[PDB]
Design a protein around this ligand. Structure first.
Ligand SMILES: [Mg+2]
Ligand SMILES: [Mg+2]
Lengths: 82, 57, 141, 94
RNA sequence: UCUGGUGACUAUAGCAAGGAGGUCACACCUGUUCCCAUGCCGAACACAGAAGUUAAGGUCUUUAGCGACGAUGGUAGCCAACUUACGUUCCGCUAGAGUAGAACGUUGCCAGGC
RNA sequence: GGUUUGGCACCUCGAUGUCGGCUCAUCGCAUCCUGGGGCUGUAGUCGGUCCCAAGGGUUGGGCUGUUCGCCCAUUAAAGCG
RNA sequence: GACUGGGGCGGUCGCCUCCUAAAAGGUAACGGAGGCGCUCAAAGGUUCCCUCAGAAUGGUUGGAAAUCAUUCAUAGAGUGU
RNA sequence: UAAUAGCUCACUAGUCGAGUGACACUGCGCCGAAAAUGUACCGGGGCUAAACAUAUUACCGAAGCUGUGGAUUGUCCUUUG
RNA sequence: UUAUUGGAGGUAGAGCACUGUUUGGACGAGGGGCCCCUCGGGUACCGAAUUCAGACAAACUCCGAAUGCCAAUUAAUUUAACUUGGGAGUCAGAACAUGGGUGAUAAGGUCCGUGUUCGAAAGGGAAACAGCCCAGACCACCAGCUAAGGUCCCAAAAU
């Protein structure tokens, strides 16, 4: 009946709000984040710096562009605003 | 190419994407009817509401 | 009731599957085989009973297979309870059957005795059935 | 070796289920002779043709111009309906 | 476009197998006095040499046996709409995977020898 | 089927009074007796099982708060709801 | 003391990772699996160097378990937790 | 078959002088199908179509829309009206 | 809102290449006894060795759709979008369809996402009815055309 007697598993509010935070064809400012992740689900290219949680940003203004490298693993690479 | 439209079956009970896409064309109360020049854009904007609208030309 | 066919769990609780549709899964081993056709899924107990039948009525040995195995449990919890609390204990195992699987197959016999044993099976399962010959797949590469 | 044919238009919307209901059948043929073709064909005379030459025999498929010799590759049978769909031919070499 | 160094390209480059050549490339290679160095060891790294050789590494030729690529067609599924409560059906968008066909024994940039 | 033990929390909290028994009945039929039938491993009397049929009838007491239940002695039968 | 499929007893009360979660994110349940309430003066920083588990076979310690020994081995190992 | 005697229902002449068989996917149907105040899930009457399916032309049908009249708002033409 | 281009993720689906499950073969690497020998033969079951074929998965993925989501010195339509300041209300939601968990592929069940309507919205149809279906009432008319659903009487319209 009621109560008897169990777990209570369930630790259900556990959130961090990852993902992507910009898109291709998007002007962007220095210091701005593009894409949170972990490990290297995306690598950086040019005009980029990474951080102590595998975040990504742009050291300099420009225009975001993702790319392919080796049939598995991508990379992101700002290129110069004209 | 002009194109006479006519709304026939209303928007009530229908979701909002359809609804907004109707009012985009300047379609107020039922049986209202505008005339517009044709495009890929406009006809694709009809195709979302193809059932509840007519096209004369 | 009885659950002979079993395995290492890997986990004892699982969200169910409930069937929608498919075809396919032709015969590959024997000659004659049973095709499930319709609305249900299965427990192991049933399959065992069907095997008892299909082994008796065929003397002369006569070969049988079961192309499927229940990889899935079937939970059902204490008697006369209020709902709510944690998912219940184990009672059963399951082998889902969309319309198009081929449960039972045989060879070594003629066309008849097969057909009888298969009647005597399909009375002992939920699903409506159909009798089939191995003449063709829908692909051979 | 004798099959009466209609030529298919390759955009035959899922109402082509009518064709399959009519006993007609779709198929294609390719390989060495030409690049690609879609056709119609009768099921009846096809199951005749299986026994006629055999599985991998040399049918002369129908066009209206030149027939093409073929060595039938594949088909996608469906149970619960007991029939064939989308036969696969092959214009062989010489 | 012969060789070599360095770059770019989704392994169509690869992997397995076999054939051929070297004192101009490179390599094996002789040796450890010095540079230096090996947790034991000049095997490795490194320095000094060029006795012998094409065997290996590496280069070129050919192979489609392995792996990667791979359409077209039609199938499953599904966005919208009509019926319907039907482990739904019919109609209109879209369009897989698996698979056959076929493709594949790389392609180009810069320098320097030639 | 919606008679039981249950799940649900939709009416009821400025009140919907619940167990059992007495009097009263009324109904359904998935028939307990009578009426008619089929089958039988039914010789006969007695029977078992199945079917149609609900017109009428379906008991006194001991024992417990008692539904239930056990028992005595009857009876054509001592119905289930 | 609150939750609470009436309430009570039972169980939990914060944080990290997953799944349920519907191809962005987010997204509950007394739904399903696991943990944390630290450790390090090197296991940090930096410059150099190297590449493992498994497998085969011969050999003292013979679950072929111990180190050896090459070959095969596209990461199947290891990654303070 | 206590066991056997079996006209033969094993095969053809005879009559007979054309249909006869077995499967495949199928549409609509039948039984399975028994309740409780009084028909009793067609809404009732009633229906073999006034039912089911396909295809068509018409029509009825709301405070929708349209026509006329009036009023208020508010944007224009534009003191206008 | 739509069109066009680009783009992140890994569901449905499919599949076995890792994880783990599984059937029947092939099996040889080799064993256990009962027994022969007495150094070996080992005569049903087997691990893994290696493989043929066929399968399974929310917490497996070599792969991977539709939809949606993010931006475009882009184009058409259109009328909304943002800040500040003043004022509140609301925190008990329900049904229908839909992807799902739980539950018994039970509930007018419960818990979430998705959308509509009711709530705050009458009217026509669903016999009758809050949510289903068509459709959004400014007022009046003894005018008309249609929507869903219907045309033998009830009850207007095709026996
Ligand atoms: Mg007394
Ligand atoms: Mg699946």
């Amino acid at each position: 009946k009621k109560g008897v007697s169990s777990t209570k598993n369930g630790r259900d509010s556990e959130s961090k709000r990852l993902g992507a935070k910009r898109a291709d064809g998007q002007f962007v400012t220095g210091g701005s984040i593009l894409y949170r992740q972990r490990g290297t689900k995306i690598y950086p290219g040019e005009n980029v710096g990474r951080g102590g949680d595998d975040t990504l940003f742009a050291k300099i203004d420009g225009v975001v562009k993702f790319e392919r490298k080796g049939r598995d693993k991508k990379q992101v690479s700002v290129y110069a605003v004209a | 190419a002009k194109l006479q439209i006519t709304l026939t079956r209303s928007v009530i009970g229908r979701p909002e994407t359809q609804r907004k896409t109707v009012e985009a064309l300047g379609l107020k109360k039922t049986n209202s009817s505008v005339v517009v020049e044709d495009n890929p854009a406009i006809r694709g904007q009809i195709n979302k509401v193809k059932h509840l609208v007519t096209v004369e030309e | 009731m009885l659950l002979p066919k079993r395995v290492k769990y890997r986990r004892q609780h699982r969200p169910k599957t409930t069937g929608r549709s498919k075809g396919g899964n032709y015969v590959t081993f024997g000659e004659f085989g049973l095709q499930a056709t319709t609305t249900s899924w299965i427990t192991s107990r049933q399959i065992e009973s069907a095997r008892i039948a299909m082994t008796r009525y065929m003397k002369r040995g006569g070969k049988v297979w079961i192309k499927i195995f229940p990889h899935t449990p079937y939970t059902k919890k204490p008697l006369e309870v209020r709902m709510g609390a944690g998912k219940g204990a184990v009672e059963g195992w399951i082998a889902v059957v969309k319309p198009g699987r081929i449960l039972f197959e045989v060879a070594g016999v003629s066309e008849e005795v097969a057909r009888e044993a298969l009647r005597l099976a399909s009375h002992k399962l939920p699903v409506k059935t159909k009798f089939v010959k191995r003449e063709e797949l829908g692909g051979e590469t | 070796s004798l099959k009466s044919i209609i030529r298919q238009g390759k955009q035959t919307r899922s109402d082509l289920k009518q064709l399959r209901k009519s006993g007609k059948v779709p198929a294609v043929v390719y390989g060495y002779g030409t690049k690609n073709v879609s056709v119609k064909v009768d099921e009846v005379e096809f199951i005749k043709v299986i026994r006629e030459v055999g599985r991998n025999g040399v049918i002369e498929l129908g066009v209206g111009s030149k027939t093409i010799k073929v060595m039938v590759a594949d088909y996608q049978f469906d149970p619960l309906k007991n029939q064939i769909t989308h036969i696969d031919f092959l214009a062989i070499n010489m």
